[PDB]
Design a protein around this nucleic acid. Sequence first.
RNA 1: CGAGUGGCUUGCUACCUCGAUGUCGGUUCCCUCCAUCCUGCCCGUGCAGAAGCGGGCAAGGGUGAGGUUGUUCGCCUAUUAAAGGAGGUCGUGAGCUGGGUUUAGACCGUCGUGAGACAGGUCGGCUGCUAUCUACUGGGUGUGUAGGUGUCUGACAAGAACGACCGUAUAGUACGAGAGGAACUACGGUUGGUGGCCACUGGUGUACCGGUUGUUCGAGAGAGCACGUGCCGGGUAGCCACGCCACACGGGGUAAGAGCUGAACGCAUCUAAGCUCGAAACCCACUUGGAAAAGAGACACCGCCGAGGUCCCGCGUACAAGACGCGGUCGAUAGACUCGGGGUGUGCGCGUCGAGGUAACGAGACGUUAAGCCCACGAGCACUAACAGACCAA
RNA 2: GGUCUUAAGGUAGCGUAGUACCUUGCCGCAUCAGUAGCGGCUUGCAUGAAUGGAUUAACCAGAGCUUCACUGUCCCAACGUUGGGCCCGGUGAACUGUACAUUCCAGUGCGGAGUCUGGAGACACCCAGGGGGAAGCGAAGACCCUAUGGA
RNA 3: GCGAAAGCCAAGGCCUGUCGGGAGCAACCAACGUUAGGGAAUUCGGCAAGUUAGUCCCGUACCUUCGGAAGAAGGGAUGCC
RNA 4: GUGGAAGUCUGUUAGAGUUGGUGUCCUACAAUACCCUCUCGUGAUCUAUGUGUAGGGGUGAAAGGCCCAUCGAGUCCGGCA
Lengths: 337, 53, 132
Amino acid sequence: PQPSRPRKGSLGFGPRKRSTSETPRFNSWPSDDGQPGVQGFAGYKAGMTHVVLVNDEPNSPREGMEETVPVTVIETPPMRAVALRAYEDTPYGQRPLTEVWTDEFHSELDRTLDVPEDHDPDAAEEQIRDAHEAGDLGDLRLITHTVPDAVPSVPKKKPDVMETRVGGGSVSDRLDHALDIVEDGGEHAMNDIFRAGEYADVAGVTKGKGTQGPVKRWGVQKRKGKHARQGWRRRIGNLGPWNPSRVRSTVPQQGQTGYHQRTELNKRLIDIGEGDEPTVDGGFVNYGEVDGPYTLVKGSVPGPDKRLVRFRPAVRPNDQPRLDPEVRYVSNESNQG
Amino acid sequence: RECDYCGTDIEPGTGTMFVHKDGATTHFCSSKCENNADLGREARNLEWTDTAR
Amino acid sequence: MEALGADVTQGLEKGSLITCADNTGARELKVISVHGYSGTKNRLPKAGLGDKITVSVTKGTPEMRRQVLEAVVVRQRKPIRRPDGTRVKFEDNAAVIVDENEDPRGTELKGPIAREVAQRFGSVASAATMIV
RNA sequence: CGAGUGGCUUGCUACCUCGAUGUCGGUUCCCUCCAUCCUGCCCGUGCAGAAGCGGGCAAGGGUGAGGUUGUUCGCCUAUUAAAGGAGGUCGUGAGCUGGGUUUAGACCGUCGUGAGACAGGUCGGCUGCUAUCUACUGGGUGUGUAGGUGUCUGACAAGAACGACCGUAUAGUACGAGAGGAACUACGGUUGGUGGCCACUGGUGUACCGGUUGUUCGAGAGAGCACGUGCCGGGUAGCCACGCCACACGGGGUAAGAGCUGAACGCAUCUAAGCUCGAAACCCACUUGGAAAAGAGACACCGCCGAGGUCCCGCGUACAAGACGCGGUCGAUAGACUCGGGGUGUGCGCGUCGAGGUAACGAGACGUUAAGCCCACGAGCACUAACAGACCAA
RNA sequence: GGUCUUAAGGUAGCGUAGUACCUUGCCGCAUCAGUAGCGGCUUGCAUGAAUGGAUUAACCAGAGCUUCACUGUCCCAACGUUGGGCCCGGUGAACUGUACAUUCCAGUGCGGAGUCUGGAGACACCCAGGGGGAAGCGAAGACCCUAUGGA
RNA sequence: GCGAAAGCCAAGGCCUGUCGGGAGCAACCAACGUUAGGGAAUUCGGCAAGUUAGUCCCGUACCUUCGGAAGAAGGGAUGCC
RNA sequence: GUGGAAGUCUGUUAGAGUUGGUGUCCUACAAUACCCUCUCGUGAUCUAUGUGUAGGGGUGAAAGGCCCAUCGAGUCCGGCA
Ligand SMILES: [Cl-]
Ligand SMILES: [Cl-]
Ligand SMILES: [K+]
Ligand SMILES: [Mg+2]
Ligand SMILES: [Mg+2]
Ligand SMILES: [Mg+2]
Ligand SMILES: [Mg+2]
Ligand SMILES: [Mg+2]
Ligand SMILES: [Mg+2]
Ligand SMILES: [Mg+2]
Ligand SMILES: [Mg+2]
Ligand SMILES: [Mg+2]
Ligand SMILES: [Mg+2]
Ligand SMILES: [Mg+2]
Ligand SMILES: [Mg+2]
Ligand SMILES: [Mg+2]
Ligand SMILES: [Mg+2]
Ligand SMILES: [Mg+2]
Ligand SMILES: [Mg+2]
Ligand SMILES: [Mg+2]
Ligand SMILES: [Mg+2]
Ligand SMILES: [Mg+2]
Ligand SMILES: [Mg+2]
Ligand SMILES: [Mg+2]
Ligand SMILES: [Mg+2]
Ligand SMILES: [Mg+2]
Ligand SMILES: [Mg+2]
Ligand SMILES: [Mg+2]
Ligand SMILES: [Mg+2]
Ligand SMILES: [Mg+2]
Ligand SMILES: [Mg+2]
Ligand SMILES: [Mg+2]
Ligand SMILES: [Mg+2]
Ligand SMILES: [Mg+2]
Ligand SMILES: [Mg+2]
Ligand code: NA
Ligand code: NA
Ligand code: NA
Ligand code: NA
Ligand code: NA
Ligand code: NA
Ligand code: NA
Ligand code: NA
Ligand code: NA
Ligand code: NA
Ligand code: NA
Ligand code: NA
Ligand code: NA
Ligand code: NA
Ligand code: NA
Ligand code: NA
Ligand code: NA
Ligand code: NA
Ligand code: NA
Ligand code: NA
């Protein structure tokens, strides 16, 4: 009688096309609770390995026992805030007002930017505080970028620039906290924001797979029984009904797959170390060797090895953060074998 | 743990625990070892095997 | 039901013939259903370790042959995962007939039983020889 | 008995197509309706409890698997929260299928003088086309906004991004003579859906290594062919799923409903004015898209003889063209070499052993030898190759 | 009914049949479940003796059913090989074409509209795709009736 | 080797079953390989694919027109020196 | 034991046939083709060459089958505008 069945694939990650920036861009931000702070970082994906742990969860009957967890290694060398951007409130949303920069620029920030030569860090500041007096000062975000140079395994040097948000106690407080972070040289690190045990959201541009059929792109079925030896093996029965005399978009078709942005929710941070504690024997295949500032992530992460992935304190966490979990054994055993 | 076929130390968070018809337990560190036993070979004769070394 | 404390990958389907692990007078059992499981269009009903199934007695004593009885999966050939990541596969697939309260219809159990089975069906477990 | 609504069925009508709008059933894939089977919130009860019975709001999501039958229908099983119904040319044959209806062959029964018939039954019996327009999925080139780099904003658009169940405690408690037997709330898990990933298990892996049958290069050594590997054993990377990770709560406004204050109507009344609450549904939240939003945006910096871009060169975290991304001696972008890490599994040769044989000869065994061989990865290393240079630009 | 039509009035068999409308007949075997199959029963709508009946070993690209074995038929798909496919050089057709044509939702009309009416939406050009629509293309419908047609 | 069978190789013939170059070479298709656990749930129907296999020894049911059924089935062996 | 009968078996010997795939093709390589699958294969066998039967006539182990891509009455021209 036509047994029911949910559709094939989600209409929520559309239109399934190539992404505009190989660098992820957050749409939402964490609310302003605790003290003033930057709400995000970044680093380059290195690879996969397991870390043995002590069951943390106080509601796990197994609480306190051994437990092997999968971990995606990621290199998170210190990023640099090069400016403070301030948006104002208009009846047409939020618009940038101005930017306050520094002078100390990374030896290679010119590979991407037309690095400033003569800026006014006082008058812009001035204009900012004035907007605040008036009551039209919308949130404050810093223009940040990385040091791809800091990761040998990463071939690129040309910095991936991107804007993260600062939200603290009052607005005044984080305006200053912002100013100061910048004034110096903008240098900051993972520890400054995150802490092992905590929950974060990892956004990234998925592994790209070129054009693909609907079977692999929408999870439709290949032809079955006798049908499959007929001249159609991996294509749907129809594009639609007679009327409406047209093909909908809701119908699964051939197209671009992968290299789309996804902000994968609630990722746990196992540990944030430095050095080669994580690195594998032989070397992280198609990636290289890790040694330096990093972060261990529970589960999978968007994108292949070498891709930039951004962090943000989970905005919709389900569990309370069970800080600094005990790390009993991080496997270094080769990935080939 | 140690492999009940080859004898090489087994990497924690890796492996299969085969359970026989009688009840006996045999931990293998790899698929290579499993299939090398499914043929009829004894770890002693295989040179690359630590049991044999 | 209560957590198995292990990850299973179903090794059975509705229609699968398996071994009857007890002195009930049943030798061959045929899977028929899976308690608390509803599939999806076309997907043939999957049965794995520690699942209360519904069975048809395939082979055995002329009194037990063709009887619709409940039972519990105690062994299977597909690898099932434990907390520490190790995998665990058995020699064959099997289950012991059970009644309403979930107490074994037979007296003794033949062959081993995964330790995870104990946590869901103790009455079956407390009657076990080897618990791997 | 009386009034009606819908257009699934059936019938009537003969307007539409006979220079053809491909049948029934099924399949697949897509949007929808509500007259709601489950799930959410309610009401009544012949509502103690549990379990039901009848009604109301409600279309978010679900609504599965099999046995006989071409069947639709329907009959039967076991599961299930429940396994609701209907529309889209009785949705879908320039998609499949062709079991039935309905060609030609043949048999049976019935009828017939007969040719032959049947709204009887049965066996066999074909599925054409290189898409012009439109439509949608993805991908590029231009123009407009009127120099470039980077970062943004968000008109609007898409989502089911989540649905449901079992279990533990609450509890053998409330209630009940008893039997039996709840809930709020807190936890843990499974299932369906969804998005991503490959440490792990599994698949592949006609890269790779080994065993071996036939035959040919005299033997040996080393190789070719045996369908795109002879067969067999093992299998890296990668791609994968049978593997692994992640997928709320809460607000705001309401429906059915429960109420408040309250008059018309001194009283009473949830409604008329007003106010409090209240659905899995609606709005936000959250994910994805999105300056071509013609009101064609905002910021910062560089530049208008020069900022920046194209071709070029070495390559990919990208890839059907096009596009995207990185590097280019101020260098590790690629190759070579060497290590590292891996796959095989002990090389030729020679020494010894070797059932035997007058001898020739001798399959094989051991040692040499974790050997020989091999790598789609990593590192070291400028040795080679990233050189020369051309073009556009306010 | 305990003979009348029309000469006789179904004997052996066979039987729910490739014949049985009723029909998925009833009972059993078998299955979790069997409009199937087989056996029995059988008043056979409307079986039956050379219009041959029954029975039957052997044979069969003949028709229906069951079990063991086997497997990607399916659960539920993956990865691979070879030829295409895609980009370049060369060669180079056909189908089809009233016109206009970037449409979509409704409506309306000879009652199934890209072209009417009202709205909505739409910058142009191009590549690739699987075919929703043009009641797509192909064939002056084989189906039906009509003709003081044909064979 | 049973063989005018396979398969590999002569003698002889041919590179004219007559367009080419490039991309780890995407989707899609055509021939095909392998697929864990399950094993006809697929389907009108096991359609398609697969399974078995050559020779020798042991052994062989019902039924039968005494010819057959039968290679029934079932069981073991197979190399090289 | 000998003997070696047979519209006998196996069988891509050669040759003959055409079961399923409803595959490939379906402006083809082809106005009936390719591939795998399958049937016979000492006889009512297959085949070449020659030769006989002619249109309401042949020929037909009968399908209204065949008689030069033409058959429930061939083809050509004529009757015919
Ligand atoms: Cl199909
Ligand atoms: Cl079931
Ligand atoms: K018509
Ligand atoms: Mg690996
Ligand atoms: Mg390993
Ligand atoms: Mg189905
Ligand atoms: Mg008419
Ligand atoms: Mg049409
Ligand atoms: Mg209603
Ligand atoms: Mg009650
Ligand atoms: Mg809906
Ligand atoms: Mg239809
Ligand atoms: Mg429909
Ligand atoms: Mg169509
Ligand atoms: Mg058609
Ligand atoms: Mg038919
Ligand atoms: Mg038929
Ligand atoms: Mg038929
Ligand atoms: Mg076609
Ligand atoms: Mg070869
Ligand atoms: Mg019968
Ligand atoms: Mg007679
Ligand atoms: Mg108009
Ligand atoms: Mg006509
Ligand atoms: Mg007629
Ligand atoms: Mg006539
Ligand atoms: Mg399999
Ligand atoms: Mg079936
Ligand atoms: Mg077949
Ligand atoms: Mg013969
Ligand atoms: Mg077909
Ligand atoms: Mg002749
Ligand atoms: Mg006839
Ligand atoms: Mg002629
Ligand atoms: Mg002819
Ligand atoms: Na085909
Ligand atoms: Na085809
Ligand atoms: Na009607
Ligand atoms: Na017409
Ligand atoms: Na149909
Ligand atoms: Na609903
Ligand atoms: Na049915
Ligand atoms: Na129609
Ligand atoms: Na068709
Ligand atoms: Na059809
Ligand atoms: Na609410
Ligand atoms: Na613009
Ligand atoms: Na008669
Ligand atoms: Na296959
Ligand atoms: Na179309
Ligand atoms: Na040539
Ligand atoms: Na004799
Ligand atoms: Na053939
Ligand atoms: Na004539
Ligand atoms: Na004439």
